[PDB]
């Protein structure tokens, strides 16, 4: 095990993350935040907050549940949405910890296709691992940290593990 | 309406490209075009790979086109060959919004279970509205949503040219 | 002519550069600002403010003064009222063309001491670049012609901020 | 301590990065090679062979002797002009980009460019100037602890890329 990002880096790629969703949309109008699986759904929470704070109006978010990666053969699908608000010509931020495969991005896009015809969907992620399976990137990206296949990211969320921190883990 | 690559830059391109396909995927891999345009793209891509490693690349086609309340859909497919555990690479001549590429992907996907899926495009020219993007590029090209990119290949037009026209 | 960048996309831009800037370096520790010509003077000014508001200790700033005589880029003069030796300098320019003008200013920090990094931000990077440098923070990345001019005019010095191509 | 390049993933790289030389330039005209070190003027020498099989006309090649500790110009032995040329300077690897910096210098001591630009083997990070590569045969990620060792067969009669320490 070692530890690769602290709170504070944490706290600091978020709030870059949030202005640059904020400076590439010129402005949050038409833009919605959907999470994935629980902690992707944590961090679009802490993206909407910080948004508000920086602009003054708050940001729609958006709920995707998807099966587990970890706590296996796969390939992963969609339990659930819930997202209480129209998606059509909005501009859809996807947004999980991790950015593996791509295999739980797709499905999630899938899920937002099936509910609406977005303008545009985008992705932002914690933090790139590499190893890509499709032919999927993230927009945001908080950091890119290269890996081998046999590693595994671990992300840890206030919300549930009552401490920030990104850690590799041997296999 | 300017030319932005001639015969000899498209050449090269793809030269390149082949070359950084057998890097990356050191066996074999599989060559999906899509479209008519995609399908030579691929076709010349899997001439090239043979004459540079002596072995041959399986080719599969993919046809896609639009309907009315937009989005594109696939036609048809000819794939040969198995895609379960295999690299399948997708060419396409332009990526623009992603949105034929991902119907592209959700085809390869019925059929099996690939490994992976890459991207081969002779023209990337941004505005992406999914995300996706592509492994191999030939040129990236600037330009606004006004403008169209249109990729003259020989096999159909008899001239090989990339050009920008705006309407 | 067109115009690229108003005044809120510049502000917008300039905030985000600042906590990159911090977050790369993992705070401001050690940390030193350069501007390059009157317009990168300014806004290594603005983002030293910003950095400050946003982490609560002050960013020095210094200047590069360069001047033209291909005609090749020469260092007029310096004010470095700091030491660079084993700093992170921070390089601030408006526009990244050819890169030339940065590879002078680079080697006048070199000059002056010898820093642990020098890194480069600027507001806009138009591309066609005859040395290898890149900048580490970029505001707008901004495709152009050869022949296609990239203006920026700062609030100190023209009254209006903003950006905007010209041709010839 | 691992290989990560073997002889013939180098092979690759460098016959890739012959092909993306004359595709950037739209051929050969005006360019030359000049390497850094005494690795660098093998893989321009290897470069510049690679690219008369292509094209079918010579490259000229020149060397930069550098050595350390600000690493600095021992030497430049380039026999052709360089104003007006596109010049591509050859290294091993690329580090803090300190090496390359100097490399640069000379070459500008020399005369006027029309452009300079960099072809590495291995790019590792850690950059310290705002320096990067155009052509790049593979992108490693590394340690500040940990070292990039590349074998060539001109002078270690093996051809590889490790990591070591
Ligand atoms: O090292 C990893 C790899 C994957 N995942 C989880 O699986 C998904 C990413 O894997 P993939 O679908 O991109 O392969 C994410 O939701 C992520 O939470 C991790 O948590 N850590
Ligand atoms: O400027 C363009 C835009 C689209 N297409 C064609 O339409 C599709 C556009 O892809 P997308 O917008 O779905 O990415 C591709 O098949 C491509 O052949 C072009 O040829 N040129
Ligand atoms: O389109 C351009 C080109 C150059 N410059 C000015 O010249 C320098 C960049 O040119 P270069 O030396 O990077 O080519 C900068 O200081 C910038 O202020 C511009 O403002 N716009
Ligand atoms: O891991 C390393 C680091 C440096 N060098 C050598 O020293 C220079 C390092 O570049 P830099 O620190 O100057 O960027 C290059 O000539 C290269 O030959 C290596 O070979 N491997």
Do not use: W
């Not at 590439?24 to 992707?40: A, Q």
């Not at 998606?87 to 859809?92: G, I, K, L």
């Not at 015809?117 to 190893?131: N, T, Y």
């Amino acid at each position: 095990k070692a530890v690769i990002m602290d709170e504070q880096a944490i706290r600091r790629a978020l709030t870059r993350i949030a202005h640059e969703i904020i400076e590439r949309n010129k402005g949050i109008d038409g833009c919605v935040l959907v999470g994935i699986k629980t902690r992707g759904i944590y961090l679009a929470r802490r993206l909407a907050e910080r948004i508000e704070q920086i602009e003054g109006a708050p940001v729609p978010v958006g709920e995707i549940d998807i099966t587990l990666y970890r706590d296996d053969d796969d390939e992963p699908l969609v339990k659930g949405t819930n997202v209480p608000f129209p998606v059509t010509e909005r501009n859809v931020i996807l947004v999980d910890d991790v950015l593996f495969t791509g295999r739980t991005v797709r499905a999630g896009m899938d899920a937002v296709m099936d509910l609406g015809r977005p303008a545009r969907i985008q992705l932002a992620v914690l933090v790139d691992r590499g190893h890509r399976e499709l032919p999927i990137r993230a927009d945001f990206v908080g950091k890119n940290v290269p890996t081998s296949r046999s590693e595994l990211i671990v992300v840890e969320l206030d919300e549930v593990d009552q401490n920030d921190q990104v850690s590799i883990h041997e296999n």
